[PDB]
RNA sequence: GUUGCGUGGUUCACCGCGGAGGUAGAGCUACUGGAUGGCCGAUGGGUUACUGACGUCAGCCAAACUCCGAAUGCCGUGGUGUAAAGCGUGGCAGUGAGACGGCGGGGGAUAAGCUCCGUACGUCGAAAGGGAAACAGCCCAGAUCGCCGGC
RNA sequence: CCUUGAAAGAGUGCGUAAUAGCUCACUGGUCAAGUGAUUGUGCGCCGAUAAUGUAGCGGGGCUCAAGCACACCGCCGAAGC
RNA sequence: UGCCUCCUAAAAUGUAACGGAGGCGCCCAAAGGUUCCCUCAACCUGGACGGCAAUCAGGUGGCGAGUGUAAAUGCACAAG
RNA sequence: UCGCUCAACGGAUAAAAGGUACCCCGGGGAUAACAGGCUGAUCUUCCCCAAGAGUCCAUAUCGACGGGAUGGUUUGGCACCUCGAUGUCGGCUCGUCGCAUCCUGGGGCUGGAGCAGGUCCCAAGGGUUGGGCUGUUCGCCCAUUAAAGCGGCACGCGAGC
RNA sequence: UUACGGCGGCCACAGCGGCAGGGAAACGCCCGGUCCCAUUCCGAACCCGGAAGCUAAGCCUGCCAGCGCCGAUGAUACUGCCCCUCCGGGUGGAAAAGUAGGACACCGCCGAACA
């Protein structure tokens, strides 16, 4: 996942601070991945976390990314000295705060989603928990 | 990169209530960020200098924020 | 039907309703056709009971400390990760 | 209405405010007091620089 | 900073009153961009099982997005308080390598006892005494001298 | 996909290359006061891992706490007062 | 390496880095002064060549156009 | 009112480039090279999840995409001590310590018939060869061996060579 | 005092849209282009001279929440200063969004008719 276009090619580091508090409830699936700490999700690790769910569950359902990485992150070549301008983008990051939901899933089974969730989230550098539409 | 320009000092000046003599700078800007209202006049770089002694007072003018002397 | 005892707020801020939480009640507000609104503390594991088990169209039959006046929910704020209650907005019904 | 005024704690690392606040009221050293009146003008005094003293209402 | 001559509360603190804001947050069918899932599906594609315009229904994001918008800080003014505030004008300076800690940021890999800014923030510098085993910069507290007194 | 029926899978996992063979899904009777899943929290366990000598409480030692949480009563303690 | 505009910049002003983006070293004798008048872009429908888009007509459209030239603040009362 | 890419744009002259390993003097740990210190990107050693391979069988063995750490032997980042001097690679002599164990010692599992092995756990008492080439460390080769370990100590050791 | 034409205040709680109703004076459309004056062409507009027609439109009145607008209380985000190692807590401020709801404006002066 990248964005077609950034209208600003070098950016600050988005802030690690706050509760989230939009996109905190499951609303497209039946379970979800709730954030319980803050973290800068790379496409990388969203892509492996897709093919986990998709390889548990093999067939049917649907799964859902409501989060997408956008926000970039830079990187000096390896052996240089500090200050001689800022670095070219080579990360793509999402900005995950507590109580966000990252992934949602529908299946029939609950046992299964439950152990596909599970693969998701240990690919994830955050601690998370699976959560439900009530 | 590197460059930038001189920081150009602007803003307002003077504040409600204050008492002003004749001439006085109220407002430093761009534009007509403020309107001149009545004994106040606009100034050849938008500059809303004072007209006449006397308190100044903001106010809003049908959309437009304006910035009156009181005598 | 659903029967439910509460109590109008001393005092109302944030200090408050975090003192109400801890002890263990849900800081709300009734208000409606009669213009004029109530402070509450509903109490929480009874409202939170009441709640689960007939779903949030439930018509909260409640008493004030001397009068009756049955009332039901309009929205509820949940916080994100304790998944808990914090308020309750309810609208007074005429039958 | 009067109150009490002791100071209790040090000025040092106190910062500008509470450090004129407390010569405002009139507070030299620890264990000082001083007697004023009940009014806004004494209790923001007060409020801005209250961890530093006990103020206790007596004449 | 100090000192001579002027001025005299003008300084500063608190309360009240009169003011300008676009930060934190939030929001976006309020703009410029990003962007998830449905539905309609323009074309492009081979009767269209591929692409998916523009729309539209829900959920979202942004230092250089803003229909919004604090707490603080800032300007003025009226009261109250406060000796060793303030201002003008002269004599004589030193300084112009800062360090760490708290809070807000940039560079850095959101590394550094890193680096560069902000902060009527602190301490050290130029501060002895008590605590931290020892331990410039952390906590408590500012040594006029004496006491085989007390808290 | 259906069936005797107290109950009764072209099978629960090794296990046959296969037809075997072993267990187990689901009930009949005995004994008779109890038996699971999960949510949140207090304190704990493992992960644990450098080079002169114990060497990550300052030491002796400490769970018969001299540890931790909450509540309470005194006292010691500076060139502070 | 001077000047101009924005962000960093923490809602007064000011604020560093070999931090993030751009312009300038002109042009206009009208593109200045004044008086008077007008409202744009886009979209829809109809119309010879004519088509997505030239000119015309009618609707809808409060500013999404435009401003000598960067950006910001302004400007529809118009600074267009 | 005119005359300056005085553009290094507060404008040293109207008028101006280089080398020094032949170099000298005054200073600086205000600032580099070695070593120490901090950091740990890179490196190193492990681990979590388990897509798969292994005829069948994720977990005998190997484990992708991702995630988390350890160490401080690599290449670096910083410029905190030392510039009125802290001698710099390799070899020699003499060592000492760690264990992340090369051999010998003890075990579990095995896709362990036996002999041989693979992998993991415990274990630091002792041992751990001689030559060719290169200044070499490293490496390759030759002949052996139970084995020909990896590292720290100013990359130990020049008032010891 | 009532109810129509002007000039302002104010700039959506006033706007946009929808449905009905009106012509005494007035405001309008309306009839013409000799005269002042006018069209980057056009008496359409601007200007001038009139009074056959009509409330169809403008304008005015009433009713509609449809679109738009305003919008609390409470809670929350954030935050000044303290306590506190963080986690958190105390005390003082306090949003944006959403909800209940509001809203199809209000006021002043002059003239005419009525008084
Ligand atoms: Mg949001
Ligand atoms: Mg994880
Ligand atoms: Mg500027
Ligand atoms: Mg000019
Ligand atoms: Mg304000
Ligand atoms: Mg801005
Ligand atoms: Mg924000
Ligand atoms: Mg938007
Ligand atoms: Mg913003
Ligand atoms: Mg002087
Ligand atoms: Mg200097
Ligand atoms: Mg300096
Ligand atoms: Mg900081
Ligand atoms: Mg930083
Ligand atoms: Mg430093
Ligand atoms: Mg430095
Ligand atoms: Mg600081
Ligand atoms: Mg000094
Ligand atoms: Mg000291
Ligand atoms: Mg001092
Ligand atoms: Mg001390
Ligand atoms: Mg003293
Ligand atoms: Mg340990
Ligand atoms: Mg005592
Ligand atoms: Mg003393
Ligand atoms: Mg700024
Ligand atoms: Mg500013
Ligand atoms: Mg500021
Ligand atoms: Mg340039
Ligand atoms: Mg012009
Ligand atoms: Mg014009
Ligand atoms: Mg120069
Ligand atoms: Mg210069
Ligand atoms: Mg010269
Ligand atoms: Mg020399
Ligand atoms: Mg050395
Ligand atoms: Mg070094
Ligand atoms: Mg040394
Ligand atoms: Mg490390
Ligand atoms: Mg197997
Ligand atoms: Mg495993
Ligand atoms: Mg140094
Ligand atoms: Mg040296
Ligand atoms: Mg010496
Ligand atoms: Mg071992
Ligand atoms: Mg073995
Ligand atoms: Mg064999
Ligand atoms: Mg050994
Ligand atoms: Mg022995
Ligand atoms: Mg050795
Ligand atoms: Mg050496
Ligand atoms: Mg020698
Ligand atoms: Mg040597
Ligand atoms: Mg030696
Ligand atoms: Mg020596
Ligand atoms: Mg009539
Ligand atoms: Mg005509
Ligand atoms: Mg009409
Ligand atoms: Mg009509
Ligand atoms: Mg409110
Ligand atoms: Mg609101
Ligand atoms: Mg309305």
Same mark, same amino acid.
């Not at chain 1, 976390?49 to 998709?54: D, H, S, V, Y």
């Not at chain 2, 004994?39 to 106010?59: C, M, P, Q, W, Y």
């Not at chain 4, 109150?3 to 004129?20: C, D, H, Y």
């Given at each position: 996942?990248?964005?077609?276009?950034?209208?600003?090619?070098?950016?600050?580091?988005?802030?690690?601070?706050?509760?989230?508090?939009?996109?905190?409830?499951?609303?497209?699936?039946?379970?979800?991945?709730?954030?319980?700490?803050?973290?800068?999700?790379?496409?990388?690790?969203?892509?492996?976390?897709?093919?986990?769910?998709?390889?548990?569950?093999?067939?049917?359902?649907?799964?859902?990314?409501?989060?997408?990485?956008?926000?970039?992150?830079?990187?000096?070549?390896?052996?240089?000295?500090?200050?001689?301008?800022?670095?070219?983008?080579?990360?793509?990051?999402?900005?995950?705060?507590?109580?966000?939901?990252?992934?949602?899933?529908?299946?029939?089974?609950?046992?299964?989603?439950?152990?596909? =969730?599970?693969?998701?989230?240990?690919? =994830?550098?955050?601690?998370?928990?699976?959560?439900?539409?009530? | 990169?590197?460059?930038?320009?001189?920081?150009?000092?602007?803003?307002?000046?003077?504040?409600?209530?204050?008492?002003?003599?004749?001439?006085?700078?109220?407002?430093?800007?761009?534009?007509?960020?403020?309107?001149?209202?009545?004994?106040?006049?606009?100034?050849?770089?938008?500059?809303?200098?004072?007209?006449?002694?006397?308190?100044?007072?903001?106010?809003?003018?049908?959309?437009?924020?304006?910035?009156?002397?009181?005598? | 039907?659903?029967?439910?005892?509460?109590?109008?707020?001393?005092?109302?801020?944030?200090?408050?309703?975090?003192?109400?939480?801890?002890?263990?009640?849900? %800081?709300?507000?009734?208000?409606? /056709?009669?213009?004029? %609104?109530? /402070?509450?503390?509903? %109490?929480?594991?009874?409202?939170?009971?009441?709640?689960?088990?007939?779903?949030?169209?439930?018509?909260?039959?409640?008493?004030?400390?001397? $009068?009756?006046?049955?009332?039901?929910? $309009?929205?509820?704020?949940?916080? %994100?990760?304790?998944?808990?209650?914090?308020?309750?907005?309810?609208?007074?019904?005429?039958? | 209405?009067?109150?009490?005024?002791?100071?209790?704690?040090?000025?040092?690392?106190?910062?500008?405010?509470?450090?004129?606040?407390?010569?405002?009221?009139?507070?030299?050293?620890?264990?000082?007091?001083?007697?004023?009146?009940?009014?806004?003008?004494?209790?923001?005094?007060?409020?801005?620089?209250?961890?530093?003293?006990?103020?206790?209402?007596?004449?």
């Amino acid at each position: 996942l990248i964005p077609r276009k950034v209208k600003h090619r070098k950016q600050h580091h988005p802030r690690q601070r706050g509760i989230a508090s939009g996109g905190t409830t499951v609303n497209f699936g039946d379970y979800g991945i709730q954030a319980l700490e803050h973290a800068y999700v790379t496409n990388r690790q969203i892509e492996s976390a897709r093919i986990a769910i998709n390889r548990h569950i093999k067939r049917g359902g649907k799964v859902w990314i409501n989060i997408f990485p956008d926000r970039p992150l830079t990187k000096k070549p390896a052996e240089t000295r500090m200050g001689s301008g800022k670095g070219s983008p080579e990360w793509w990051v999402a900005n995950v705060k507590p109580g966000r939901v990252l992934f949602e899933l529908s299946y029939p089974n609950e046992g299964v989603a439950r152990a596909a =969730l599970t693969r998701a989230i240990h690919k =994830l550098p955050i601690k998370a928990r699976i959560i439900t539409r009530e | 990169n590197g460059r930038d320009s001189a920081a150009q000092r602007l803003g307002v000046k003077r504040y409600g209530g204050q008492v002003v003599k004749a001439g006085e700078i109220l407002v430093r800007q761009r534009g007509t960020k403020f309107h001149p209202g009545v004994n106040v006049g606009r100034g050849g770089d938008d500059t809303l200098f004072a007209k006449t002694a006397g308190a100044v007072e903001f106010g809003i003018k049908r959309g437009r924020k304006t910035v009156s002397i009181v005598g | 039907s659903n029967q439910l005892r509460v109590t109008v707020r001393t005092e109302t801020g944030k200090g408050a309703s975090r003192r109400a939480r801890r002890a263990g009640k849900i %800081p709300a507000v009734l208000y409606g /056709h009669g213009a004029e %609104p109530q /402070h509450l503390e509903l %109490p929480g594991h009874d409202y939170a009971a009441v709640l689960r088990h007939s779903g949030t169209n439930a018509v909260l039959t409640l008493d004030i400390a001397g $009068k009756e006046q049955l009332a039901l929910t $309009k929205a509820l704020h949940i916080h %994100p990760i304790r998944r808990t209650i914090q308020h309750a907005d309810l609208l007074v019904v005429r039958r | 209405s009067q109150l009490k005024i002791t100071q209790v704690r040090s000025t040092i690392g106190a910062r500008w405010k509470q450090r004129e606040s407390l010569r405002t009221l009139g507070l030299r050293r620890i264990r000082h007091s001083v007697i004023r009146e009940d009014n806004a003008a004494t209790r923001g005094l007060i409020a801005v620089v209250r961890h530093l003293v006990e103020v206790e209402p007596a004449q």
